[PDB]
Design a binder for this molecule. Sequence first.
Ligand SMILES: *[C@@H]1O[C@H](CO)[C@@H](O[C@@H]2O[C@H](CO)[C@@H](O)[C@H](O)[C@H]2NC(C)=O)[C@H](O)[C@H]1NC(C)=O
Ligand SMILES: *[C@@H]1O[C@H](CO)[C@@H](O[C@@H]2O[C@H](CO)[C@@H](O)[C@H](O)[C@H]2NC(C)=O)[C@H](O)[C@H]1NC(C)=O
Ligand SMILES: *[C@@H]1O[C@H](CO)[C@@H](O)[C@H](O)[C@H]1NC(C)=O
Ligand SMILES: *[C@@H]1O[C@H](CO)[C@@H](O)[C@H](O)[C@H]1NC(C)=O
Length: 671
Amino acid sequence: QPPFRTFSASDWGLTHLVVHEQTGEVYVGAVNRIYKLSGNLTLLRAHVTGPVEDNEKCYPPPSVQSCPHGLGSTDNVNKLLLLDYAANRLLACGSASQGICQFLRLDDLFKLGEPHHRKEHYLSSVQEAGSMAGVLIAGPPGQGQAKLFVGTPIDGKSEYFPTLSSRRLMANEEDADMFGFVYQDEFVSSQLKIPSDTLSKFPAFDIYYVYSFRSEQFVYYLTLQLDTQLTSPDAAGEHFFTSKIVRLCVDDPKFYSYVEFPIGCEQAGVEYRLVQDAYLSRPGRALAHQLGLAEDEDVLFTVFAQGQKNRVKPPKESALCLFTLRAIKEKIKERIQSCYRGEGKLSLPWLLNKELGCINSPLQIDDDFCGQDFNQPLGGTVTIEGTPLFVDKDDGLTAVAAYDYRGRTVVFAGTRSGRIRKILVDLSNPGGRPALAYESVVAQEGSPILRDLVLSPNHQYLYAMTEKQVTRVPVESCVQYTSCELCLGSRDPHCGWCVLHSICSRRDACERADEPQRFAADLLQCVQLTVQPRNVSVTMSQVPLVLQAWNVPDLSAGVNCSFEDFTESESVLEDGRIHCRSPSAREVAPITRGQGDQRVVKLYLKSKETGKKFASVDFVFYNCSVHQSCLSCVNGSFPCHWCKYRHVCTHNVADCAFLEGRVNVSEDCPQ
Ligand SMILES: *[C@@H]1O[C@H](CO)[C@@H](O[C@@H]2O[C@H](CO)[C@@H](O)[C@H](O)[C@H]2NC(C)=O)[C@H](O)[C@H]1NC(C)=O
Ligand SMILES: *[C@@H]1O[C@H](CO)[C@@H](O[C@@H]2O[C@H](CO)[C@@H](O)[C@H](O)[C@H]2NC(C)=O)[C@H](O)[C@H]1NC(C)=O
Ligand SMILES: *[C@@H]1O[C@H](CO)[C@@H](O)[C@H](O)[C@H]1NC(C)=O
Ligand SMILES: *[C@@H]1O[C@H](CO)[C@@H](O)[C@H](O)[C@H]1NC(C)=O
């Protein structure tokens, strides 16, 4: 119900976000600036990094060696952003001066360093953000050494920048060994350069790195490369693309373990092969036993745009697909044993060019086999297919994230309209559909969500970032539902009905909700109320009602009968039934004064424990007087008698002139 905790931006737009797992503080990378915010998006420190005097053509940058083509003030876009919790700092890699990286200390953003005089201190000169991705890997704790796996496009600058490397993280930020490959010799290094040939063959070619995540002893990347097949050498602009997973080992210094499989999915014969975002989540016991996975097995959610055409602006039509971490390690261990049998060949047209074949070997591959000097780098033959969960043909999907709540498996997916649909994944939905979009919160109308979309540590809020602002969006928003009938009808996995407090909340937000009937799990368990009798004539006073309440806790605390906001009779309880009194006709008079033929009024049950009304039931006051004809009287839904001689309609039949004026039934009416 309250408004969204918000943090707008200066003149500069945002690019990346990440949350400190322990302090819950929110570090936000952006153009020229790197803001650090607090749990509620309150600004803490703001570190400026631009604009700077630079040209993209200056290799090395002007801060090391002079440069010819001329300088000019240009914006320094933060392309990547990671936390080194072990070293209590933050790595913000910019787009300025061939893409050096800064080391902002965590608790004040003190520029600890920006090493900028070596060749491998320049990661890439690309200007887009969101095309860079990577992970940190702390070594033994006392040592202080770490590693940093970075994939980036290189814009055909194959001599300067590797497209994917494994550089080292020194404890002393000024050190010149920063960003140096963790294994270097004349033959192979922890590097992976694009062949000077393929860029000569195919002019504009690059690997863009969307997501990246650590899993088991590996690191996986979801890349999106230009298809070397579906595109002619002519760089007209008709180039199609192909999304591919990539995986390395953390303990593979020579980079033998490389592997690259295409990915995508379909639903109703629609192709989706342009990866957009991806999130690694543990699926929670509900979706777990549904998929046969152990409690330690993970899942990868993905977002694909339709087709393979146009990378810089994919079509709106998008799908949220699922890959189980099992099924990916399988298609690998099946294709890299397929090599160690001598069948087929390594198939990487961009990295290898000349069709080298697979070599035989009497070795049995594990799940944890990290390559050898043969049968690598290994290609991908069949595109790994994903499981479609949700399609959107109107407002494109742009970002993804997920977690679990009390078994149920929740997926948050950002849209180009700026909304964040809350998706529940279950295979046992009787409709045959696997996912239900149970809500569509709007974080900022008219701005696509950016793919960074992480939760607070307590999983309470999800920070949904656009170009213009961050938005602390509440995961649970159960209070918004007003009655049990639609609190549980929303199918929100967090939401149940706290019956005795008349509020929609989480199973732990309802006081004493473990006791029976205090909480409502299934819809067919909403509070139900019945009254005997439902109607009384305004002529009557204080007629005894008997109410029967169903699906309610131990009401022995005490309960009142409240007729909307008029009478408030205190009640008594016997067996399973609630006795109380109708209003006295002195009280009934202003209730029905005006409402004419009848008035329905809500007969509530106010509990002594809470003090709030929790159960409602319709109660009717009728007024036989207002009926004008003999038939207005009789055929009325309620017992009214027509006095044919006085020409009036009443309840207590003593009002008639004589008895023979008693007209009970419609056929005994005169005309
Ligand atoms: C008005 O209330 C009365 C009583 O609560 C309802 O009349 C009952 O109708 C059933 C069905 O024929 C009978 O078995 C009961 O004996 C009736 N009771 C009495 C006291 O008449 C009546 O249906 C209600 N009508 C409306 C429109 O609410
Ligand atoms: C039941 O209905 C009758 C008729 O509508 C109400 O009596 C009328 O009250 C108005 C306003 O005071 C008078 O101007 C009319 O002359 C009255 N008509 C009759 C026939 O008495 C009566 O007040 C209603 N009873 C309740 C409890 O609301
Ligand atoms: C926001 O949170 C900070 C700490 O995280 C707190 O000091 C501040 O009072 C809060 N302000 C608002 C408006 O919520
Ligand atoms: C129940 O009704 C009586 C009658 O006035 C009132 O005094 C009492 O406060 C009511 N109980 C609650 C919980 O409102």
